[PDB]
Amino acid sequence: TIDEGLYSRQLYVLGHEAMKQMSQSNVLIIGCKGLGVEIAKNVCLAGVKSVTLYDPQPTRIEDLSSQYFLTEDDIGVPRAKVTVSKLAELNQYVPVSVVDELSTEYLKNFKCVVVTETSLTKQLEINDFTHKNHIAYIAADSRGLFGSIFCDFGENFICTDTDGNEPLTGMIASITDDGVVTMLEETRHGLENGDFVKFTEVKGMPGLNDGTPRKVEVKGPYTFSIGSVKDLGSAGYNGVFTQVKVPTKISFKSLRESLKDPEYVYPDFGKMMRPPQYHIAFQALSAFADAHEGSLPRPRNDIDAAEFFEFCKKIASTLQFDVELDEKLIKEISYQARGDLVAMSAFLGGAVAQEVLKATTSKFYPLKQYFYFDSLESLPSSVTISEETCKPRGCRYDGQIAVFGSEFQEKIASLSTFLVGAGAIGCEMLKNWAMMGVATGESGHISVTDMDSIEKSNLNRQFLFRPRDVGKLKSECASTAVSIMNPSLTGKITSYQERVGPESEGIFGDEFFEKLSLVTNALDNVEARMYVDRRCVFFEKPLLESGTLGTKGNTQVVVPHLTESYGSSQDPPEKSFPICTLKNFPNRIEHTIAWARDLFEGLFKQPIDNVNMYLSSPNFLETSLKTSSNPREVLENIRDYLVTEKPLSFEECIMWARLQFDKFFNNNIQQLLFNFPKDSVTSTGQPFWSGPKRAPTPLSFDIHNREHFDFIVAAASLYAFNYGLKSETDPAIYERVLAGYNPPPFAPKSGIANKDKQELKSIADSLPPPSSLVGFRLTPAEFEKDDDSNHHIDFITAASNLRAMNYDITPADRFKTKFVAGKIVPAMCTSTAVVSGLVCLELVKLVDGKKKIEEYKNGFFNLAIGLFTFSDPIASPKMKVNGKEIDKIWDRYNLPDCTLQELIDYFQKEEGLEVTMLSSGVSLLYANFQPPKKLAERLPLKISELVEQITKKKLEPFRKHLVLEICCDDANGEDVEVPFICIKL
Template identity: 75%
Template sequence: MKIDTSDGETIDESLYSRQLYVLGHDAMKKMSHSNVLIIGCRGLGIEIAKNVCLAGVKSVTIYDPQPTRMEDLSTQYFLHEDDIGKPRAEVSVPRLAELNEYVPVKAITDISLETLKNFQCIVVTETTLTKQIEINDFTHQNDIAFISTDARGLFGYIFCDFGKSFVCTNTDGNEPLTGLIAGIDETGLVTTLEETRHGLEDGDYVRFSEVKGMDALNQSQPLKVSVKGPYTFSVGPLENMGTYISGGSFVQVKMPLKIEFRSLRDSLAEPEFVYSDFGKMDRPPQLHVGFQAILAFAEENGSLPRPRNEEDAAKVLALSESIAKKLKLDVELDKKLIYELSHEARGDLVPMTGFIGGIVAQEVLKSCTGKFYPIKQYFYFDSLESLPSSVELTEEECAPIGSRYDGQITVFGKKFQAKLENLKQFLVGAGAIGCEMLKNWAMMGVGAGPNGHVFVTDMDSIEKSNLNRQFLFRPKDVGKHKSECAATAVGIMNASSIGSITAYQERVGQETENIFNDDFFENLDIVTNALDNVDARQYMDRRCVFFQKPLLESGTLGTKGNTQVVLPFLTESYSSSQDPPEKSFPICTLKNFPNQIEHTIAWARDLFEGLFKQPIDNVNLYLSSPNFLETTLKTSNNPREVLESIRDHLVTDKPLSFEECIVWGRMQFEKYFNHNIQQLLFNFPKDSVTSSGQPFWSGPKRAPTPLVFDAHNPLHYDFVINAANLYAYNYGLKGEASPDVVEKVLSSIEVPSFTPKSGVKIQVNETDEVPQETSADESELKTIVDSLPAPSSLAGYRLNPCEFEKDDDSNHHIDFITAASNLRATNYQIKPVDRFKTKFVAGKIVPAMCTSTAVASGLVNLELYKVVDGKKNLEDYSNGFFNLAISLFTFSDPIASPKLKVNGKEFDKIWDRFTIPNITLQELIDKFAQEEKLEITMLSSGVSLLYASFHPPKKLAERLPLKISDLVESVSKQKIDPSVKNLILEVCCDDEQGEDVEVPFICVKL
């Protein structure tokens, strides 16, 4: 679906939907007016260009007059070996242009100051400091955003100058806070309902609405907040604004913030840093000088310092000291750090270009949109912990060899490169992060050696909305398997990778353990997750724990992301910590007392299932399952409702034409938005009071108003027409009747009058018992059953259930939910929202940005270097969290795996186990008693109880002589799959004092 903007332009929502939920339509519109120039298109430049193209600016222009060299292939994934000698920009343009049909890409050969006027943002890489200052002087004076950036080995930096008066319209990108009001006193003290904290901070601004008795307050400008407590805040004296009576709500207002940037020339001597790691507070000032020294060295010598060359490193150190003195910077230089920067100056690592390139691309978008707080002004980063300790890094070891991996060899050496190439990796998921992982690995050479391999699995097929961030896919790939397309794409990037990748289309889970079996996992070195759901992550975590394999975990949410390292016998596992449960709404709120649009959307989503999915499934089960009626009568909480629904769908309300579907839709409108509301008001009139004398309709409870159908009201019409189309789909009828036909049908419908009933119970509070309809006696149920057509009379007949799909704009699903939600919102005087917002909530869409996935993948692969090196200390590794919206980066040591002691012997609570051969049960009991001084009191395999000390003697006599595998088969009544080589047994034991103790599980080797 293409959304028209106010000036007639369109935004392709089907392509940009996940990004739109991060940036919003206004920001996307501003981006569509922004031309971006990127100078330099080696690995870092092309990574920035890739992300900016995917994001959807007006145009991307690249400048790079250099020819392609073999070392460029270390990180520049749009260059191939047969491109060597050709201009980098010329070769890259058509491959960049494939990423987004809406973003034209071109190369220019001139970057004169006159040319620079055509751009809203200019990104500079691989450029001398003298040239950077010249360009920035011009951009600073002409309000053109300027970003300078570079990545040298495991070091990187970013400098941003967005001008003298840059306006940031939304500093954090979070949704505005909202809340309901319980009271406002004459001093301006606002008390919110005690259901939820207001979440505001001092200095925030809010706007009020629907405050009874204070119309002037409802119409006032945003007011500044002073927080007084979790449920109170003050907005100052409220003179001449009336007296509070009841009700009302507040919404946080995002106020624009003006930010002043200094030019590159002026900031060199007075740098302002964004710190990424509070354990390295001394690094940014030193790297600020060191990067300048590297550029000065290159200008003086015509080339960068040689890898691991002490003479060149000494010159860089001397230049650093000279620059610090010249700029009068109070910085104490660490010789080892500056030497390392010199040693790695020619290094070109794709995890670093991905990490830095993702951040820079987000800064480009900030400069174009004013959305999110920019880097102000310098950002320095290093990952020296990734350097290997398992190999000696000498000048000879790190000398280039004419390989595409020379940029990596320069930093890690040839021996470490061989380790990477012979790695066996399993990537679970080939979506956004998965694409970035495979790209990185292809450039790094992971698995490309004679003994290496990469396995990737993903059960999903490519959809159009994937193309905005899953950059290995193109429009021609829509509908194809992700894993296969991704493997093919990286094979083009690095031909030596194509034969080293095996693509699967299977979901990971118990049902595929015959594919990803014991042999498969035991053959792996590392597992990397690129998943989008917790269940699959937890399953893979369990498998990695069992097979004692390192697991690299990551995830993103909009501009946020996190990475986690899971290492056998060193860290806790992924499942050791849990995210908070997903927020849910009380049933009584959804059914009867909504007060926010999320309530009505959730209600409409349930209504969709209740009208077009669940009853259709029941009909099909009735027609196909001989035992359906018997099971329903025995197990259903409300068998009459189920049976009546089947009767209605097959007899009473069965449509024969689309016109009858329109009639049905019109009746649904009457039922849900008029009759049900009348019934609610009959039970609780608008003037009713509680037992304490308080108005019933107060606080979060809004008194609803029944809707009177109006065929000329677009919202009323949309509900009926979308309901009719979905109902027609259920029956295989053709929908989409012309407006004239619909209007004619609607005008001919006679809607029966409705009289509210006495005795109808309505749940008021969450703690109340849920009202149940009066159960039917056997004679009533028999009458309904007798009215049903026999399944044999409808042999082969089936209805079509509506399986909810949020991304198909033609299926009426989101359109129906939007109309239903907004009608219910109108009932309750809640402000309706558009289809875009409804789709986000109803579809539980995870906002996503290509920038975040690039950053997350970069960080994961910096940890991969450490895992391959085999580092043993916990502090060598980092778990990361970032939020690109506010330029926040935090790193912490992983949490150590917990330990436990049993009879004086220490075990790792997560990673240890008792490994035994397939012995008899008696031998196992004796083995534990003799070797571990433990008495086994209970033994189980899955849900099968194999042994318990309280078993009767006869059962024990039968089981004790059996081998464990035979015992498992005997008790479970199932044969063990021949591919299974390990049996897991849970064991309960008593120690020497007879106390119950926690012990690791038992692994039986078959």
Template identity: 60%
Template sequence: MADKMQTEKEDQKIDESLYSRQLYVLGHEAMRRMANSNVLVVGLKGLGVEIAKNIALAGVKAMAVYDPTPVELSDLSAQFFLRKEDVGKSRADATQPRLAELNTYVPVSVHTENAISDLQSLARYQVVVLTETSIDDQLKINKFCRENNIYFISADIRGLFGNIFCDFGEGFSVIDATGETPVSGIISDIDEEGLVTALDETRHGLEDGDYVTFSEVEGMDGINDGTPRKVEVKGPYTFSIGSVEGLGKYAKGGLFQQVKMPKTLNFKSLSEQLVKPEFLISDFAKWDRPIQLHIGFQALSKFASTNGGKLPRPMNDQDAKQVLELAAEIAKTIEEGAPEEIDEKLLTELSYQARGYLSPMAAFFGGLAAQETLKALSGKFSPVTQFMYFDSLESLPTSTTRTEESCQPIGSRYDAQIAVFGKEFQEKIQNTKEFLVGAGAIGCEMLKNWAMIGLATGPNGSIHVTDMDSIERSNLNRQFLFRAPDVGKLKSECAAAAVAVMNPELNGKITSMRDRVGEDTEDTFNEDFWEGLDGVTNALDNVEARVYVDRRCVFFRKPLLESGTLGTKGNTQVVLPNLSESYSSSQDPPEKSFPMCTVKSFPNRIEHTIAWGREVFDSAFVNPPQSVNLYLSQPNFIESTLKQSGNQKEILETIRDYLANDKPLTFEECIEWGRLKFEKLYNNDIQQLLHVFPKDSVTNTGTPFWSGPKRAPDPLAFDLDNQEHQDFIVAAANLHAFNYGLKGSVDLSLYRKVLDSMLIPDFKPQSGIKIQANDNDPDPNAGAGSGFTDQDELSKIVESLPAPATLAGYRLTPAEFEKDDDTNFHIAFITAASNLRALNYGIQVADRHKTKLIAGKIIPAIATTTALVTGLVVLELYKLIDGKNKLDDYRNGFINLALPFFGFSEPIASPKGKYNDTEVDKLWDRFDFDHNLTLKELLAEFENKGLDITMLSYGNALLYASFFPAGKLKERYSLKMSELVELVSKKAVPAGRRNMIFEICADDKSGEDVEVPFICVKTKDA
């Protein structure tokens, strides 16, 4: 029995090094449910393979695919796992080996029975996902699935149109509807009516209908029983839990914790939903479209069933007329919400595009359908109920003419795209020059889509992709162009090579680079590079890089496609020259930080102790070795340290201790060091804190000091048999040994031998020590008050240091923080350090997984969101290639697959200004001068514009100000602008730079200060 339980436990073990980013979105329980489930995907054109790819990456138990249809050349327009040599083979047989490479934990097989007619063969699956399946067949399979408790999903795309339908049966339980982290807080009062007030006007963050539990409430023992209580919000700082009769009278203290309560959904069958459809609205600007497309997709299926399985021909009016007739008949069957009349223009366009197949639409619905599959298996997040329709008709080109002739197949891999856009627009796509910044998760998906649509494959097209990062194992879960043998290789090179295999026409058209895009690489990404581009696409994971690329795009007036994901959330933004605001026009809210006083002495949340644990890691294993190495390598290190204020003594004592007092010669001494570290942090320091602030302390207003957010701590007594204590000692000893180049060990018998014979000195709290009591109080140990300016004491420490010459060649090795290496003890130490601190303060401990998320500042990510967001970006890229020049042609997107929610809006217009009678675009306009004119000539140019320049600067160099002395100005008036820059900044203008950017302050004709654009002057090398 024990062996069986161990086997089951091992079966449920999740490879966190592979799934780490996904785990932070779905959680362990959802992942375990998925890992016990079998999925069938029917249909392996572009949409089917996208769904299957995302499911395989997510980590189900097994997946089967079914599609006996022979591969056609046009399938290559969106099916990225098919090759020209696969034409004639069955789609399933050709695709299965490449799907199987994605995730070694997910076996992928070909479903050998007829999945359409042999319904019993479906009984072994938990989810069946249908694509490229007629409505009649969907009805039969849906009926069987409902009778056998199998979750059912169907999805299809037709050109720029698509739909999805979900049926998870009766009584489907959603265990977490939103995926948001449960909120918690500290209580200041619960009145007799059950009104709960959060501490110090802290927003509670709850909504009506939420549930909370309570703990540590004094005077109301009956409320601490863990019973979830329903919330009615009364205000941002108060909420009601109803009657509290019989629970006691509130005295003080207490915490509340939100609890996710299961929600039950009852799905209707496909046959019921066809006539009484429920829609999830994908675009509120098109609220009336779902019912029209609901009828239209049924009409297409009916058309195919009466025309030998063939969909309407591209741009064919005769076929479109038949579709409209069928739609009119189907409309009569709609029992609820039927339209007053058929939208003939819309459904004609649907008919025109029915044979079209676009990679970004497959990416959009492939991400959505895969996420719905994971919801069915895990119960995590709210499903689509039950139909959703989406279109991107705005992506149709207007710069080229579509005719029936221009949309006919030409024997090209792009025929399914030509069926939608026509041959002329396909040529535009192929002759585009695009720059992709980043080759991570979004970058991989972007390149895949670009390869499918044929971007840059023409004679004048090109793609440049740059990424300085190498591939890590955790990338393989969502950066699908990479495989296990690629770990350690450069992302940009592997990604470029992978998509060139998907579309060999990219060979010679895609250039991979390894440079970071920033000021230090402007010689590489120079003016010629930027001016030669048609557009830029960001696939970045940090704000700083995004801002820099955005500014470059603004300067060179290049369109920018921006996007990002956070778990199930995603956003897209289009930056349009001379039309829209840019990425930098708005800012994300600042990253949340914790007051240092709280972290250092008064934590009340696990997040506080994790932040503290990260600081302890740096102060023990990173900063000291770095200081030692600087002391040994820089002759003036002591001199520069003594000139600092505040922490000279700490730095010098650290160097002394790490080179002499605490320098270990054996690993046993590292164990002793770790034991003393434990004693100081979790016993001595706590005793000292309680000596300064005893548990019965009161404030000057008479209230208990240890109340509200302040939790009174207790010292810990070391016990090697306690797992948390053990983890700390093992990690600390091994990291200390790493600093000194000693071999570590995890042999507990060695630790026990060392620690059993070790004497721990008694600690007696010191008087006179001051500790900051509140975040708003001044730090009593800051600056001169710390006593660190005692020069005699500092001199004695310096004299005690070993001379660098006696340690020639000696170096310590800092433990540079790396969160994804499970063997380096970094996260192990921070987890143990944080949890011991939590035990000091009576805070619920966190596992390694949560600690890693917070300490490593990890961005949760899943493949489904990335695929969907990238699809939206490429739909906007079509518009840019077309040259659309109105804001309302474009869409910024905001999605949350957990809810699910889709929101779209046109980009915000760039800010406008005015000087004298001239209107200007504050973002995109500038004053251009094509020659390297003198300062006097520049000032005269602006006088002619009715502007009086009061200040002129280049970077940090002030070149001109109206208050400068006449003599100083006389010297500068005759200088060329490049000469003036070199004179004032003491630096030469780089030889290759053709543009100099100047900021100005100016007054208008009335003498009023006005906001004006910047100046761009060509250099002498232009």
């Protein structure tokens, strides 16, 4: 009963069984500050059965530093009572409640218990109970730029999936008598030693088709071994193997036991000696709070720091910890005790929510057990951070002023950022900026652009939107919501409905870009990312890129004149199958899905476009007769869709659907088997239909079969939609119409001047004149995966499954068909929260203007395995030009709008380089090998006039510069790279 219309993207990450088991689990959350509210929000969006909150502490002003469900009108009310109402709206399937008091026995009602902002004694009291009763216990803490997570899922936790990857499967070539299994040519199995695999469709060794898993002994990238198969047979050929994943048993330890001998998880290997320090430091913080009526050390206070360090020494002595305490780091933990940063809260909330999902669903590998994290590199160094600057001012930014100070707050308040996109990452980024107070000053401003509209499936991870907002523009809704969160952002946010690209340079021009301070990308495609990267490189603005894919995520920072750009790195491209594979010889469901999509486009989209263009363009026929690659095909499509096969009722649509079924699943296969019979052999004597080629078999139409009926219904409905007829779904009419159908005879054809043009002309003049048909149009079918009433995915699924039945491929369901055909990217709310947190932790580094490249960190993480890694950005490459150091990426030449000859002479006399090629955009303005007459015609023209002449398009009034790419050779004739030229018009 999972609402796939809402959890569409999440299901591709978790699955049906995982979410079904998750929707029966109760989660309790103790503490409703920024971290607690973040965890609760992520859990509610995830889809657990219910959430219970417990936090009777009255609200205070500083609590607003990271609590975005609290308003300044709520001061003096318990946090849970004022947060439950706003949390209940995120998801309608997840009730949210509040409990005034907690008793130990009550804890038995919950599947998972999360604890934040609680003293160590209470944590021990709760854990001593939740451990022996097999209740998942998670404890999270966030102190300034430091964070800690602790997990305890019981002694007998069962983890079904430990990496989150799809099972490995492959096509076998041969299996020897000694179990040596081999893959097809140039195919890597990817198995690892100790894995279990199951075989199917094996010829010559039926015993391996039973399904019993067998050990794997990887012997090479293309072969492995399974043991002794002497009894079963001597050798087997062909067959498909699939990896089998077995459950693992993980045993955790209680909090009391693990305090003495913890087991750490290292988020970074550059600092492996810190977690032992933090283990003592956090316990010392708890002891200090217990010894001062729950009052943490004051910000940047030396007396409290000394007392805290003494507590750390006492604890280290008591626990016999043979570690030398680092005074500087421990005192740093003391100074930022009262810090409350929205970025750290978001990061830890994403991590802890993922841990909760792991506990409830028994999936993915959980943290075991302590996870201590710090982002101390973000601490400002260009401003004064002292006790006087960090003292609270009685405002909502106290939680952040306690870490960064008032001067850095003033620096933040005057930012002028530019956010591209308003998706999940966009919503999280706007929330973080609103909480941090970005652009709340006199000179501040924020600009957000996005051209898409809100859909139902987006509400699962874009918390700024509500069901009542479906169909509206993302940017306006996001701006209004964030203005609601932080009232100071009223009028400081601008929202555009413009797509960022070449066509929008009139709005995001030189004037717009010259005022910005940084650009943040929240996109999902590489084209827009590259374009924004080029614009930032040209204007020299810091850029923040971030991306997610399921549970994986990465964040990168581009700094002018320091690091390389986004486009200097490459990623694996998409896989497109050979046309010969799709057209005739498929062997995987992906091939059949691609063929079905092409069939849909060619049946319901392209002929309609041709017909419409014929009825609009007066001279379409003449242009097509010498422009298109197949004018006869276009003419035949027009004739068939206008006169020959124009339906007058839905019965004719059903008949047409039956005819097309015969055409595509019964006759083409007969032709193929006539050309290449099943017993034919290749030129080398090997059988033709062996290995990657599977012998097809024609299908005979059986009305009772489900797949045939689904295809007929979908095709008839889409045809009626094309012709605007009234479709029907009752099987009675279909069964009545298809009963009286006489298949036209078909016999495969063996084959065996200028009159063709005469036939084409005769067909052309047979068509009705355009004047006779005025106001008549045919509705094309535009593919839309997200709508379940347009029969698009239904048709694709039916066609794909029928073609799979042709080639004996295992058919897939509508779920996998929608995943494959729609190019759906799996997405999660937890990954979005984590990437937003990392990006906002890098933003403070950018604001402070750090110069060294070792102070910035590009981040990568995978939450399925609990892996976090951070590495320094790559420095921009340097080069030698005319005996000078030039940055390859961030340097350019600035020249006036001189003539081409003057530009060449300047490059010859100044840089001592001979210009051999000069281009702008996608046009070749000048080349050394062009005929002399053309150059003499182009040389004395100005650059702007030359560009206008060559591109045949006048320059727009808003155009203020030209970017030219130049390739030049040195005096000796050696090619030397040079930076691009920025001609100022």
